[PDB]
Write a protein that binds this ligand. Sequence first.
Ligand SMILES: OC[C@H]1O[C@@H](S[C@H]2[C@H](O)[C@@H](O)[C@H](O)O[C@@H]2CO)[C@H](O)[C@@H](O)[C@@H]1O
Length: 445
Amino acid sequence: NTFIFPATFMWGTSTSSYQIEGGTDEGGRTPSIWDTFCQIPGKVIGGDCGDVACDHFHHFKEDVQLMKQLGFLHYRFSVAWPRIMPAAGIINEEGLLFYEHLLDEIELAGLIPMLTLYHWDLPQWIEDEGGWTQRETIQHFKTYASVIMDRFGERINWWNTINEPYCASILGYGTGEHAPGHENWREAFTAAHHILMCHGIASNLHKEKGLTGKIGITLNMEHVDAASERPEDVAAAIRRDGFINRWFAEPLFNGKYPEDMVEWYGTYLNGLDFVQPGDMELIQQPGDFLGINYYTRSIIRSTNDASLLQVEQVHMEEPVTDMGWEIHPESFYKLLTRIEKDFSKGLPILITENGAAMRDELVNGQIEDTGRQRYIEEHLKACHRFIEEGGQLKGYFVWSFLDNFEWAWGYSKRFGIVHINYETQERTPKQSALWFKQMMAKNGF
Ligand SMILES: OC[C@H]1O[C@@H](S[C@H]2[C@H](O)[C@@H](O)[C@H](O)O[C@@H]2CO)[C@H](O)[C@@H](O)[C@@H]1O
């Protein structure tokens, strides 16, 4: 009953720049959309902001060393657009220097980096111009992505372009739940089209510059089950699946948007007027691999309410994380299977994010996060069954090396395998982290 993974399998850990760096107003960095958003009353639990966070801006050498020490060969992180383009066409050298050094430290410990271009921290000055609702924002991205590839690229083995287009567009402009916080479906779908284009943009810059590092986008995806055998519930579930998965996965592989969702979004798509000749072609670039972020499944039922989808999520109080997120490892296996069948059909799949937030309690310098634990192991068995059955899973990055600013949840939630004491900033590996070390050692469990 042991679970062994390929010899070539990629074992990593990942983070996000705004979620851990801190030093928000240091080194030339100008405010990102989240620095603003977090000030809006009621948007983030406790009113928390990304100020300081894990202060990884100052503790990076210790952190990376802590990774090496923890047995990690791969590390996915993101570049804060704000540190690079603090204003229109400027280019802060002090920002690039920070990452360059980070890379010196990474390579010095013998780790393999994966740089994520955009992880939701859009410069405020750009949102002022209209942010993602403006096609003009795409050129701003081109500028940003070009500098990053010119300054590095030779040392970047893996390029992760956009992280969860869904969240940055639907939640950021549609539901108002993520920065910048707009509530306008017309803008959400427009923003979703512009951010997907940026993946194509960075893909074109990639090949144009002749880089050798693999490249790909990351899509957060969730398995969807109908709440009952009732027709409308099955209909509801289909709608949720197209809302989060198909709307972003379809254009990336099939060069088109889900016909049914397009039909359903009626007047909100405004005749799909934000699409221009070439856009879909630009977007349809799977690249070298598909990055996936999975956390939980969705159980849907239908409603006849005033919301966009008219779908209701059943709240399975069953095994759940500190976020109320149900733990259903079977669904992860089911999603991975479905993704290979449609979309990827063979292409290498990479899990750029997977983990959980449980209530942590520090006991005698140790965190017995058995829970987080029963979560990573169980989902890894899911990943093991997908392989063994022919799945193309080539890597897994446990999400959140460090506890961090958990977006709308603020610091009220802990996703790390390394516990952060915010009063002192000291790092203390949790039991799950040690388990992961011994796990990667036997390359299985
Ligand atoms: O904030 C913790 C964790 O969030 C997710 S994305 C998350 C959306 O916030 C939520 O509204 C929706 O129901 O589910 C998705 C995923 O199931 C993000 O991927 C992760 O990086 C972050 O640490």
